[PDB]
């Protein structure tokens, strides 16, 4: 039921993507970043693996 009321997917996804704009990212990590965003977009936000993916993406974009 909660899925029909709120969704924070787009905000965090765009927050990740905006960091990519200024960076000349190599392909061998561009594909990894893209696939991790894809995985995060289909994963429940309360799972531990979701937080692991989020932290890994934050470190990648840092």
């Amino acid at each position: 039921e909660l899925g029909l009321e709120k969704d924070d997917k787009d905000a965090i996804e765009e927050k990740f993507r905006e960091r990519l704009k200024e960076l000349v990212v190599p392909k061998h990590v561009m594909d990894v970043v893209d696939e991790e965003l894809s995985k995060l977009g289909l994963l429940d936000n309360h799972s531990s693996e979701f937080n692991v993916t989020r932290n890994y993406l934050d470190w990648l974009t840092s």
């Binding site: 039921e1 029909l4 009321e5």
Partner: peptide, 10 residues
């Protein structure tokens, strides 16, 4: 909107 009547109950 209408689903809130059951969401709040849950």
């Amino acid at each position: 909107l209408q689903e809130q009547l059951k969401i709040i109950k849950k």
